[PDB]
Coordinates of N, CA and C in Angstrom, one line a residue:
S1 N 138.8 113.5 166.9 CA 140.3 113.7 166.8 C 140.9 113.4 165.4
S2 N 142.2 113.3 165.3 CA 142.8 112.9 164.1 C 143.8 111.7 164.4
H3 N 144.3 111.1 163.3 CA 145.2 109.9 163.4 C 145.9 109.7 162.0
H4 N 147.2 109.5 162.0 CA 147.9 109.2 160.8 C 148.6 107.9 161.0
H5 N 148.8 107.1 159.9 CA 149.7 106.0 160.1 C 150.4 105.6 158.7
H6 N 151.5 105.0 158.9 CA 152.3 104.5 157.8 C 152.3 103.0 157.9
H7 N 151.9 102.3 156.8 CA 151.7 100.8 156.9 C 152.5 100.2 155.7
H8 N 153.3 99.2 156.1 CA 154.0 98.4 155.1 C 153.6 96.9 155.2
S9 N 153.5 96.3 154.0 CA 153.0 94.9 153.9 C 153.9 94.2 152.8
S10 N 154.5 93.1 153.1 CA 155.2 92.4 152.1 C 154.8 90.9 152.1
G11 N 154.7 90.4 150.8 CA 154.2 89.0 150.6 C 155.3 88.0 150.7
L12 N 155.1 86.9 151.4 CA 156.1 85.9 151.6 C 155.5 84.6 151.3
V13 N 155.9 83.9 150.3 CA 155.3 82.6 149.9 C 156.3 81.5 150.1
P14 N 156.0 80.5 151.0 CA 156.9 79.4 151.2 C 157.2 78.6 149.9
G15 N 156.2 78.0 149.3 CA 156.4 77.3 148.1 C 156.0 78.1 146.8
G16 N 155.1 77.5 146.0 CA 154.4 78.3 145.0 C 155.2 78.8 143.9
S17 N 156.3 78.0 143.5 CA 157.1 78.5 142.4 C 156.5 78.4 141.0
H18 N 155.6 77.6 140.8 CA 155.1 77.3 139.4 C 154.4 78.5 138.9
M19 N 155.0 79.1 137.8 CA 154.4 80.3 137.2 C 154.3 81.4 138.2
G20 N 155.3 81.4 139.2 CA 155.2 82.3 140.3 C 155.3 83.8 139.9
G21 N 156.0 84.0 138.7 CA 156.2 85.4 138.2 C 155.1 85.9 137.3
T22 N 154.0 85.1 137.1 CA 152.9 85.6 136.4 C 152.1 86.7 137.1
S23 N 151.9 87.8 136.5 CA 151.2 88.9 137.1 C 149.8 89.1 136.5
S24 N 148.9 89.7 137.2 CA 147.6 90.0 136.8 C 147.5 91.3 136.0
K25 N 146.4 91.5 135.2 CA 146.2 92.8 134.6 C 146.0 93.9 135.6
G26 N 145.3 93.6 136.7 CA 145.1 94.6 137.7 C 146.3 95.2 138.3
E27 N 147.4 94.4 138.3 CA 148.7 94.9 138.8 C 149.2 96.1 138.0
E28 N 148.7 96.3 136.8 CA 149.1 97.5 136.0 C 148.7 98.8 136.6
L29 N 147.6 98.7 137.4 CA 147.1 99.9 138.1 C 147.9 100.4 139.2
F30 N 149.0 99.6 139.6 CA 149.7 99.9 140.8 C 151.2 100.2 140.6
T31 N 151.5 100.5 139.4 CA 152.9 100.7 139.1 C 153.5 102.0 139.6
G32 N 152.6 103.0 140.1 CA 153.0 104.2 140.7 C 152.3 104.5 141.9
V33 N 152.3 105.8 142.3 CA 151.6 106.2 143.6 C 150.1 106.4 143.3
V34 N 149.3 105.8 144.1 CA 147.8 105.8 143.9 C 147.2 106.5 145.1
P35 N 146.3 107.5 144.8 CA 145.6 108.1 145.9 C 144.6 107.2 146.5
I36 N 144.4 107.4 147.8 CA 143.5 106.5 148.6 C 142.4 107.4 149.3
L37 N 141.2 106.9 149.3 CA 140.1 107.5 150.1 C 139.5 106.4 151.0
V38 N 139.4 106.7 152.3 CA 138.9 105.7 153.2 C 137.7 106.4 153.9
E39 N 136.6 105.6 154.0 CA 135.4 106.0 154.7 C 134.8 104.9 155.6
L40 N 134.8 105.2 156.9 CA 134.3 104.2 157.8 C 133.2 104.8 158.6
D41 N 132.0 104.1 158.7 CA 130.9 104.4 159.6 C 130.8 103.2 160.5
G42 N 130.9 103.4 161.9 CA 130.9 102.4 162.8 C 129.8 102.6 163.9
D43 N 129.5 101.5 164.6 CA 128.6 101.5 165.7 C 129.1 100.4 166.6
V44 N 129.5 100.8 167.8 CA 130.1 99.9 168.8 C 129.3 100.0 170.1
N45 N 128.6 99.0 170.5 CA 127.8 99.0 171.6 C 126.7 100.1 171.5
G46 N 126.4 100.5 170.3 CA 125.4 101.5 170.1 C 126.0 102.9 169.9
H47 N 127.3 103.1 170.1 CA 128.0 104.4 169.9 C 128.4 104.5 168.5
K48 N 127.7 105.5 167.8 CA 128.0 105.8 166.4 C 129.2 106.7 166.2
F49 N 130.0 106.4 165.1 CA 131.1 107.3 164.8 C 131.4 107.1 163.3
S50 N 132.1 108.1 162.8 CA 132.5 108.2 161.4 C 133.9 108.6 161.3
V51 N 134.7 107.9 160.5 CA 136.1 108.2 160.3 C 136.3 108.4 158.8
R52 N 137.1 109.4 158.4 CA 137.4 109.7 157.0 C 138.9 109.8 156.8
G53 N 139.4 109.2 155.8 CA 140.9 109.3 155.5 C 141.2 109.6 154.1
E54 N 142.4 110.3 154.0 CA 143.0 110.6 152.7 C 144.4 110.1 152.7
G55 N 144.9 109.6 151.6 CA 146.3 109.1 151.6 C 146.8 108.7 150.2
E56 N 147.9 108.0 150.2 CA 148.6 107.5 149.0 C 149.2 106.2 149.3
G57 N 149.2 105.3 148.3 CA 149.9 104.1 148.4 C 150.8 103.8 147.3
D58 N 151.9 103.1 147.6 CA 152.9 102.8 146.6 C 153.3 101.3 146.7
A59 N 152.6 100.4 145.9 CA 152.8 99.0 146.0 C 154.2 98.6 145.6
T60 N 154.9 99.4 144.9 CA 156.3 99.0 144.5 C 157.2 98.9 145.7
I61 N 156.9 99.7 146.8 CA 157.7 99.6 148.0 C 156.8 99.0 149.1
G62 N 155.6 98.6 148.8 CA 154.7 97.9 149.8 C 154.2 98.9 150.9
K63 N 154.1 100.2 150.6 CA 153.9 101.1 151.7 C 152.7 102.1 151.4
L64 N 151.9 102.4 152.4 CA 150.9 103.5 152.2 C 151.1 104.4 153.4
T65 N 150.5 105.6 153.2 CA 150.4 106.6 154.3 C 149.0 107.1 154.2
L66 N 148.3 107.1 155.4 CA 146.9 107.5 155.5 C 146.8 108.5 156.6
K67 N 146.0 109.6 156.4 CA 145.7 110.6 157.4 C 144.2 110.6 157.6
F68 N 143.8 110.4 158.9 CA 142.4 110.3 159.2 C 141.9 111.4 160.1
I69 N 140.6 111.7 160.0 CA 139.8 112.5 161.0 C 138.6 111.7 161.4
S70 N 138.1 112.0 162.6 CA 136.8 111.7 163.0 C 135.9 112.9 162.7
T71 N 134.7 112.6 162.1 CA 133.8 113.7 161.9 C 132.7 113.7 162.9
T72 N 132.8 112.8 163.9 CA 131.8 112.7 165.0 C 132.4 113.0 166.4
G73 N 133.6 113.6 166.5 CA 134.2 113.9 167.7 C 135.0 112.7 168.3
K74 N 135.2 112.7 169.6 CA 136.0 111.6 170.2 C 135.4 110.3 169.9
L75 N 136.3 109.3 169.5 CA 135.8 108.0 169.2 C 135.5 107.2 170.5
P76 N 134.5 106.3 170.4 CA 134.2 105.4 171.6 C 135.2 104.3 171.7
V77 N 136.1 104.1 170.7 CA 137.1 103.0 170.8 C 138.4 103.6 170.5
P78 N 139.5 102.9 170.9 CA 140.9 103.4 170.6 C 141.2 103.3 169.1
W79 N 141.9 104.4 168.6 CA 142.3 104.3 167.2 C 143.1 103.0 166.9
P80 N 144.0 102.5 167.7 CA 144.7 101.3 167.3 C 143.7 100.1 167.0
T81 N 142.5 100.1 167.6 CA 141.6 98.9 167.3 C 141.0 99.0 165.9
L82 N 141.2 100.2 165.2 CA 140.6 100.4 163.9 C 141.6 100.3 162.8
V83 N 142.9 100.1 163.1 CA 144.0 100.2 162.1 C 143.7 99.1 161.0
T84 N 143.5 97.9 161.4 CA 143.4 96.8 160.4 C 142.1 97.0 159.5
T85 N 141.1 97.6 160.0 CA 139.9 97.9 159.3 C 140.1 99.0 158.2
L86 N 140.8 100.0 158.6 CA 141.0 101.2 157.8 C 142.1 100.9 156.7
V87 N 143.7 98.2 153.0 CA 143.8 98.2 151.6 C 145.0 97.4 151.2
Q88 N 144.9 96.0 151.3 CA 146.1 95.2 151.2 C 146.5 95.0 149.8
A89 N 145.8 95.6 148.8 CA 146.3 95.8 147.5 C 147.6 96.5 147.4
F90 N 148.0 97.3 148.4 CA 149.3 98.0 148.3 C 150.5 97.1 148.9
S91 N 150.2 95.8 149.2 CA 151.3 95.0 149.5 C 152.3 94.8 148.4
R92 N 153.6 94.5 148.8 CA 154.7 94.3 147.8 C 154.9 92.8 147.7
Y93 N 154.6 92.2 146.6 CA 155.0 90.8 146.4 C 156.3 90.7 145.6
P94 N 157.2 89.9 146.0 CA 158.5 89.8 145.1 C 158.1 89.4 143.7
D95 N 159.0 89.7 142.8 CA 158.7 89.5 141.4 C 158.4 88.0 141.1
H96 N 159.0 87.1 141.7 CA 158.8 85.7 141.5 C 157.6 85.1 142.2
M97 N 156.9 86.0 143.0 CA 155.7 85.6 143.8 C 154.5 86.3 143.4
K98 N 154.5 87.2 142.3 CA 153.4 88.0 142.0 C 152.1 87.2 141.6
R99 N 152.3 86.0 141.2 CA 151.1 85.1 140.9 C 150.2 84.9 142.1
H100 N 150.7 85.2 143.3 CA 149.9 85.0 144.5 C 149.2 86.2 145.1
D101 N 149.1 87.3 144.3 CA 148.6 88.6 144.7 C 147.1 88.6 144.3
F102 N 146.2 88.1 145.1 CA 144.8 88.2 144.8 C 144.3 89.6 144.7
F103 N 144.8 90.5 145.6 CA 144.2 91.8 145.9 C 144.3 92.6 144.6
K104 N 145.4 92.7 144.0 CA 145.5 93.6 142.8 C 144.8 92.9 141.6
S105 N 144.7 91.6 141.6 CA 144.1 90.9 140.4 C 142.6 91.2 140.4
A106 N 141.9 91.5 141.5 CA 140.5 91.8 141.5 C 140.2 93.2 141.1
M107 N 141.3 94.1 140.9 CA 141.1 95.5 140.5 C 141.0 95.5 138.9
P108 N 140.3 96.6 138.4 CA 139.7 97.7 139.1 C 138.3 97.5 139.8
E109 N 137.6 96.5 139.4 CA 136.3 96.3 139.9 C 136.3 96.2 141.4
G110 N 137.3 95.5 142.0 CA 137.5 95.5 143.4 C 137.1 94.2 144.1
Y111 N 137.1 94.2 145.4 CA 136.7 93.1 146.2 C 136.0 93.6 147.5
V112 N 135.1 92.7 148.0 CA 134.5 92.9 149.3 C 135.4 92.2 150.3
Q113 N 135.8 93.0 151.4 CA 136.6 92.5 152.5 C 135.7 92.5 153.7
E114 N 135.5 91.3 154.2 CA 134.7 91.1 155.4 C 135.6 90.5 156.5
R115 N 135.4 91.0 157.8 CA 136.1 90.5 158.9 C 135.2 90.3 160.1
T116 N 135.5 89.3 160.9 CA 135.1 89.3 162.3 C 136.4 89.4 163.1
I117 N 136.5 90.4 164.0 CA 137.6 90.6 164.9 C 137.1 90.4 166.3
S118 N 137.6 89.3 166.9 CA 137.2 89.0 168.3 C 138.3 89.5 169.3
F119 N 137.9 90.4 170.1 CA 138.9 90.8 171.2 C 138.8 89.8 172.3
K120 N 139.9 89.2 172.7 CA 139.8 88.1 173.7 C 139.4 88.7 175.0
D121 N 138.5 87.9 175.7 CA 137.9 88.3 176.9 C 137.1 89.6 176.8
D122 N 136.6 90.0 175.6 CA 135.9 91.2 175.4 C 135.0 91.0 174.1
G123 N 134.6 92.1 173.5 CA 133.6 92.1 172.4 C 134.2 91.7 171.1
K124 N 133.4 92.1 170.0 CA 133.8 91.7 168.6 C 133.4 92.8 167.7
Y125 N 134.2 93.0 166.6 CA 133.8 93.8 165.5 C 133.4 92.9 164.3
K126 N 132.3 93.3 163.7 CA 132.0 92.8 162.4 C 132.2 93.9 161.4
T127 N 132.9 93.7 160.3 CA 133.2 94.7 159.3 C 132.9 94.2 157.9
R128 N 132.4 95.1 157.1 CA 132.2 94.8 155.6 C 132.7 96.0 154.9
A129 N 133.6 95.8 153.9 CA 134.2 96.9 153.2 C 134.2 96.6 151.7
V130 N 134.0 97.6 150.9 CA 134.3 97.5 149.4 C 135.6 98.3 149.1
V131 N 136.5 97.6 148.5 CA 137.8 98.2 148.0 C 137.8 98.1 146.5
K132 N 137.8 99.3 145.9 CA 137.7 99.4 144.4 C 138.2 100.7 144.0
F133 N 138.4 100.8 142.7 CA 138.8 102.1 142.1 C 137.5 103.0 141.7
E134 N 137.6 104.2 142.1 CA 136.7 105.3 141.6 C 137.6 106.3 140.9
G135 N 137.4 106.3 139.5 CA 138.4 107.0 138.8 C 139.8 106.5 139.1
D136 N 140.8 107.4 139.3 CA 142.1 107.1 139.7 C 142.4 106.8 141.2
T137 N 141.3 106.9 142.0 CA 141.5 106.7 143.4 C 141.1 105.3 143.9
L138 N 141.9 104.7 144.7 CA 141.4 103.4 145.4 C 140.6 103.8 146.6
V139 N 139.4 103.4 146.7 CA 138.5 103.7 147.8 C 138.3 102.5 148.7
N140 N 138.3 102.7 150.0 CA 137.9 101.7 151.0 C 136.7 102.2 151.8
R141 N 135.6 101.7 151.5 CA 134.3 102.1 152.2 C 133.8 101.0 153.1
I142 N 133.7 101.3 154.4 CA 133.6 100.2 155.4 C 132.4 100.5 156.3
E143 N 131.6 99.5 156.6 CA 130.7 99.5 157.7 C 131.2 98.6 158.8
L144 N 131.1 99.1 160.1 CA 131.6 98.4 161.2 C 130.6 98.3 162.3
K145 N 130.3 97.1 162.8 CA 129.4 96.9 163.9 C 130.0 96.1 165.0
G146 N 130.2 96.8 166.2 CA 130.8 96.2 167.3 C 129.8 95.9 168.4
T147 N 129.9 94.7 169.1 CA 128.9 94.3 170.1 C 129.6 93.6 171.2
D148 N 128.9 93.5 172.3 CA 129.3 92.7 173.5 C 130.6 93.2 174.2
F149 N 130.9 94.5 174.1 CA 132.1 95.0 174.7 C 131.8 95.4 176.2
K150 N 132.8 95.1 177.0 CA 132.7 95.4 178.4 C 133.0 96.9 178.6
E151 N 132.2 97.6 179.3 CA 132.3 99.1 179.5 C 133.6 99.4 180.2
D152 N 134.1 98.4 181.0 CA 135.4 98.6 181.8 C 136.6 97.9 181.2
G153 N 136.4 97.3 180.0 CA 137.4 96.6 179.3 C 138.5 97.5 178.7
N154 N 139.4 96.9 178.0 CA 140.5 97.6 177.4 C 140.1 98.5 176.2
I155 N 139.0 98.2 175.6 CA 138.6 98.9 174.4 C 137.8 100.1 174.7
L156 N 136.6 99.9 175.3 CA 135.8 101.0 175.7 C 136.4 101.8 176.9
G157 N 137.3 101.2 177.6 CA 138.0 101.9 178.7 C 139.3 102.7 178.2
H158 N 139.6 102.6 176.9 CA 140.7 103.3 176.3 C 142.0 103.0 177.0
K159 N 142.3 101.7 177.2 CA 143.5 101.3 177.9 C 144.6 100.8 177.0
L160 N 144.5 101.1 175.7 CA 145.5 100.6 174.7 C 146.5 101.7 174.4
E161 N 147.7 101.2 174.4 CA 148.8 102.1 174.0 C 148.7 102.6 172.5
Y162 N 149.2 103.7 172.2 CA 149.1 104.3 170.9 C 150.3 103.9 170.1
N163 N 150.4 102.6 169.8 CA 151.4 102.0 168.9 C 150.9 100.8 168.3
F164 N 151.7 100.2 167.4 CA 151.2 99.0 166.7 C 152.3 98.0 166.5
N165 N 152.0 96.7 166.6 CA 152.9 95.6 166.5 C 153.0 95.2 165.0
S166 N 153.9 94.2 164.8 CA 154.1 93.6 163.5 C 153.5 92.2 163.4
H167 N 152.7 91.9 162.4 CA 151.9 90.7 162.4 C 152.2 89.9 161.1
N168 N 151.6 88.7 161.1 CA 151.7 87.7 160.0 C 150.3 87.3 159.6
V169 N 149.9 87.9 158.5 CA 148.6 87.6 157.9 C 148.6 86.3 157.1
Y170 N 148.0 85.2 157.5 CA 148.0 83.9 156.8 C 146.9 83.9 155.8
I171 N 147.2 83.9 154.5 CA 146.3 83.9 153.4 C 146.2 82.5 152.8
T172 N 145.0 82.0 152.6 CA 144.7 80.8 151.9 C 143.6 81.0 150.9
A173 N 143.6 80.2 149.8 CA 142.6 80.4 148.8 C 141.3 79.8 149.3
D174 N 140.2 80.5 148.8 CA 138.8 80.0 149.0 C 138.2 79.8 147.6
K175 N 138.5 78.6 147.0 CA 138.1 78.4 145.6 C 136.6 78.5 145.4
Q176 N 135.8 78.1 146.3 CA 134.4 78.1 146.1 C 133.9 79.5 145.9
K177 N 134.5 80.5 146.6 CA 134.1 81.9 146.5 C 134.9 82.7 145.5
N178 N 135.8 82.0 144.8 CA 136.7 82.7 143.9 C 137.5 83.8 144.6
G179 N 137.9 83.6 145.8 CA 138.6 84.6 146.6 C 139.5 84.0 147.6
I180 N 139.8 84.7 148.7 CA 140.7 84.3 149.7 C 140.1 84.4 151.1
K181 N 140.7 83.7 152.0 CA 140.5 83.9 153.4 C 141.8 84.2 154.1
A182 N 141.7 84.8 155.3 CA 142.9 85.1 156.0 C 142.6 85.0 157.5
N183 N 143.7 84.6 158.3 CA 143.6 84.5 159.7 C 144.9 85.0 160.4
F184 N 144.7 85.8 161.4 CA 145.9 86.3 162.2 C 145.4 86.9 163.5
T185 N 146.3 87.0 164.4 CA 146.0 87.6 165.7 C 146.8 88.9 165.9
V186 N 146.1 90.0 166.1 CA 146.8 91.2 166.3 C 147.0 91.4 167.8
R187 N 148.2 91.9 168.2 CA 148.6 92.1 169.6 C 148.5 93.6 169.9
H188 N 147.6 94.1 170.7 CA 147.5 95.5 171.2 C 148.1 95.6 172.5
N189 N 149.2 96.4 172.6 CA 149.8 96.6 173.9 C 148.9 97.4 174.8
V190 N 148.8 97.0 176.1 CA 147.9 97.7 177.1 C 148.8 98.5 178.0
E191 N 148.2 99.6 178.6 CA 148.9 100.5 179.4 C 149.5 99.9 180.7
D192 N 149.1 98.7 181.0 CA 149.6 98.0 182.2 C 150.7 97.0 181.9
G193 N 151.2 97.0 180.7 CA 152.2 96.0 180.3 C 151.7 94.7 179.7
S194 N 150.4 94.5 179.9 CA 149.8 93.3 179.3 C 149.5 93.5 177.8
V195 N 149.1 92.4 177.1 CA 148.8 92.5 175.7 C 147.3 92.1 175.5
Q196 N 146.6 92.9 174.7 CA 145.2 92.6 174.3 C 145.2 91.9 173.0
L197 N 144.7 90.7 172.9 CA 144.7 89.9 171.6 C 143.4 90.3 170.9
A198 N 143.5 90.3 169.5 CA 142.4 90.6 168.6 C 142.5 89.6 167.5
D199 N 141.7 88.5 167.6 CA 141.7 87.4 166.5 C 141.0 87.9 165.3
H200 N 141.7 88.0 164.2 CA 141.1 88.4 162.9 C 140.8 87.2 162.0
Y201 N 139.5 87.2 161.6 CA 139.0 86.2 160.6 C 138.6 87.0 159.4
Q202 N 139.1 86.7 158.2 CA 138.9 87.6 157.1 C 138.5 86.8 155.9
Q203 N 137.7 87.4 155.0 CA 137.3 86.9 153.7 C 137.3 88.0 152.7
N204 N 137.9 87.7 151.5 CA 137.9 88.6 150.4 C 137.3 88.0 149.2
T205 N 136.3 88.6 148.6 CA 135.5 88.1 147.5 C 135.5 89.1 146.4
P206 N 135.9 88.7 145.2 CA 135.9 89.7 144.1 C 134.5 90.2 143.8
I207 N 134.4 91.5 143.4 CA 133.1 92.0 143.0 C 132.8 91.7 141.5
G208 N 133.9 91.6 140.7 CA 133.7 91.3 139.3 C 133.6 89.8 139.0
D209 N 133.3 89.6 137.7 CA 133.2 88.2 137.2 C 134.4 87.7 136.4
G210 N 135.4 88.6 136.3 CA 136.6 88.2 135.6 C 137.5 87.3 136.5
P211 N 138.5 86.7 135.8 CA 139.4 85.8 136.6 C 140.3 86.6 137.5
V212 N 140.6 85.9 138.7 CA 141.4 86.5 139.7 C 142.6 85.5 140.0
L213 N 143.5 85.9 140.7 CA 144.6 85.0 141.1 C 144.3 84.4 142.5
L214 N 144.1 83.1 142.5 CA 143.9 82.3 143.7 C 145.2 81.8 144.2
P215 N 145.7 82.3 145.3 CA 147.1 82.0 145.7 C 147.3 80.7 146.4
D216 N 148.6 80.3 146.4 CA 149.0 79.3 147.3 C 149.0 79.9 148.7
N217 N 149.1 79.0 149.8 CA 149.1 79.5 151.1 C 150.3 80.4 151.3
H218 N 150.2 81.5 151.9 CA 151.3 82.4 152.1 C 151.0 83.5 153.2
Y219 N 151.9 84.4 153.4 CA 151.8 85.3 154.5 C 152.0 86.7 154.0
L220 N 151.4 87.7 154.6 CA 151.8 89.1 154.6 C 152.4 89.4 155.9
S221 N 153.6 90.0 155.8 CA 154.3 90.5 157.0 C 154.1 92.0 157.1
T222 N 153.6 92.4 158.2 CA 153.1 93.8 158.3 C 153.9 94.6 159.3
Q223 N 154.0 95.9 159.1 CA 154.6 96.9 160.1 C 153.8 98.2 159.9
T224 N 153.5 98.8 161.1 CA 152.6 100.0 161.0 C 153.2 101.0 162.1
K225 N 153.4 102.2 161.7 CA 153.8 103.3 162.6 C 152.6 104.3 162.7
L226 N 152.3 104.6 164.0 CA 151.2 105.5 164.3 C 151.7 106.9 164.7
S227 N 151.0 107.9 164.2 CA 151.3 109.3 164.7 C 150.0 110.1 164.4

């Protein structure tokens, strides 16, 4: 099938005023609209699937639009469970907070984004992605491995509503890895009125050896519209 979404991300830093307006060289690559290419190969409980996306991002307004297809037919999992896996470099940091934007600072060489997503009372996704520039395009190439899912659960049972909630991504520095970590819980509405929780554990590590911006503790506030 196909899937489109519009995603907005804004950076909010409680403290962190010192040199808060200092920006990275990588931010220069994001002053206008940037084409995006997304490629995901996944395997959930042994069910293989491939998703491909084309889109554009505009970090000056913190917004991207992505259009996806499956090249392997109907997915074994709901599209909403893949939203967070399918480029936080398009977040909008306020001018006085740009020192806290790790994601653009790692560009153009990029970063590795790794997650474990644990669905409460159900299975887990392991994801590893490379986010980097190829020519003028920002590419997100992902491998996803899901295990331990219940055949009758909300994910393999396709019991999730086709919408998306707004979340708070908590970003902290990981100085030993010259990168960041993040923690947040995604709320997937279920067709019975309940909510399916998905605990996100995230690590971002620069691919290059140049300096990056290691931020103070802060949040990304997210909003996503599905169609």
